[PDB]
Design an enzyme around this catalytic site. Structure first.
Site, short mmCIF file in Angstrom:
data_model
loop_
_atom_site.label_atom_id
_atom_site.label_comp_id
_atom_site.label_asym_id
_atom_site.label_seq_id
_atom_site.Cartn_x
_atom_site.Cartn_y
_atom_site.Cartn_z
N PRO A 90 129.42 56.27 70.85
CG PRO A 90 129.76 58.29 69.71
CD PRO A 90 129.65 56.79 69.49
NE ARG A 91 124.39 54.11 69.02
CZ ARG A 91 124.67 52.96 68.43
NH1 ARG A 91 125.49 52.85 67.40
NH2 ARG A 91 124.09 51.90 68.90
#
Lengths: 274, 95, 192
Positions: free
Chosen positions: C8-9
């Site tokens: 999630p990046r």
């Protein structure tokens, strides 16, 4: 007849020894200082597809007519919806870079293949049919030289003690005599590096040109970066509506901020006491 | 990969010389730079597989317009082809 | 196909996705976090249907991991660092600049090298040239290993999988360096 307020627009051609000829769209080289190109842009965002296609088709027609081989450029002047031939450069040009960036086609590799006898569309050469050659985004090229804007654009000389370039997405660099430790001489062109930026739009490419120009550190000689920045930040440039006379009739472009050289002064002090 | 161009003499200097050399290397073609006396330290000379002084004795621009010496170097190095880049001899009929 | 993970990046390898779609991912992160919509004119991300693949791109991370010493990251002053460029070349620098001091505390990454072409094969020719054209002196790098990978015909084919490297011991044979320059300098140094 001395045409009034023209756009200088150039079409890129490639021909092989098997009667195939192809154009790689156009480039806008209107941004000139006393008739020498400073910043180049591709495609030209201030013309209709309709007119773009007439100009390209004209170029192709002329070069088919003579069975032109390898890379070449056809130069036109464009006034409103009219266009007039002026010149053919039967050679690769400085500003081929941007055309590579918006079409995907390696022009210099293409010259070598062609001279070795291949056809444009040989699988190894991989140039598509005219209909399958498209424009992807927009690209701008700035040539970074040692021409000092504060001294009449006279090329500076000497050892480049600091040379640091830039990168990231949408940045292309083609070095000349720019490397840390090089000695610029007065005998040839001053060119240190050609800086090119690309974006899905001209605006996106413009933001990058600005950042990259600012991010460059070059010490030991003067450069033309202050001038390029002025050009690239001017709202006439951002608009895409400029012509041959833009630079020569925009005297703001020759006002430069004062250098901040706090570093250098601090070092003189330290140097002196030491 | 190529047909008969195994080696290329790049008859230029500077930015375009380096541009051509890179293209050559990508195509597994060997490269020959030339450089004038005054460009002895020019970094295009470092980007080729081989390099030779051209135009000894001549003024600096003339050095890269020395047709005879360029040809000598091409022949002596076994170059199959010469890329003239832009400026200099790129548009010269005689060359 | 089977799900395994979400990151999630942004990731290291976002670069190649930017190159084959035209979309600046990191600028897009900033616009989004400021409240804009993907398709706002400023953000300029197209509708799913209008997002296409343009060519192929490869990324190689150039580190100071020494292949001749178990990929242990080397350290010290980078006395020479000279990179490359030209068409289809992208560079994203880490601690690679001439005069930098690589420490052992963080990643070794000097520079991420990315190449693009209308085809994978075209991109592959460029990766080769660029890797070879790099000069980096003062520390060891993983370039000999990257070259082995990039020259290997399994790589060129496009058919490799998770086990490729671990089961291809040729990739760990390196040419012996002729460091004729360095030796010549030792001689000149010694007599001087």
């Amino acid at each position: 007849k001395c045409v009034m307020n023209p756009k200088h627009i150039e079409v890129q051609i490639l021909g092989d020894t098997h009667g195939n000829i192809v154009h790689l769209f156009e480039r806008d080289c209107s941004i000139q200082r006393r008739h020498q190109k400073v910043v180049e842009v591709a495609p030209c965002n201030a013309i209709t597809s309709e007119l773009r296609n007439r100009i390209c088709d004209a170029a192709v027609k002329l070069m088919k007519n003579v069975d032109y081989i390898n890379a070449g450029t056809v130069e036109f002047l464009v006034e409103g919806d009219d266009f007039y031939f002026i010149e053919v450069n039967p050679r690769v040009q400085v500003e081929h870079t941007i055309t590579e960036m918006i079409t995907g086609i390696d022009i210099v590799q293409s010259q070598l293949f062609i001279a070795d006898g291949y056809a444009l569309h040989d699988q190894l050469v991989a140039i598509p049919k005219q209909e399958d050659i498209h424009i992807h985004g927009s690209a701008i090229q700035s040539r970074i030289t040692t021409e000092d804007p504060l001294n009449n654009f006279m090329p500076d000389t000497g050892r480049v003690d600091t040379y640091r370039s830039t990168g990231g997405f949408g940045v292309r660099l083609d070095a000349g005599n720019g490397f840390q430790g090089t000695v610029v001489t007065p005998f040839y062109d001053s060119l240190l590096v050609k800086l090119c930026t690309w974006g899905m739009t001209f605006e996106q490419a413009t933001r990058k040109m600005r950042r990259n120009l600012i991010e460059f550190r070059i010490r030991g000689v003067k450069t033309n970066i202050p001038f390029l920045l002025n050009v690239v930040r001017h709202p006439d440039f951002a608009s895409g509506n400029y012509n041959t006379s833009f630079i020569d009739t925009t005297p703001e472009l020759f006002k430069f901020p004062h250098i901040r050289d706090r570093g250098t002064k601090t070092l003189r002090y330290i140097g002196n006491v030491t | 990969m190529m047909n008969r161009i195994k080696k290329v003499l790049v008859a230029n200097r500077g930015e375009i010389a380096i541009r051509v050399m890179r293209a050559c290397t990508e195509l597994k073609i060997k490269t020959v730079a030339i450089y004038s006396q005054e460009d002895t330290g020019s970094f295009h000379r470092y980007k080729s597989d081989e390099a030779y002084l051209v135009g000894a004795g001549k003024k600096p621009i003339d050095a890269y317009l020395d047709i005879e010496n360029i040809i000598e170097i091409a022949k002596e190095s076994g170059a199959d082809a010469i890329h003239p880049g832009y400026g200099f001899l790129s548009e010269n009929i005689e060359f």
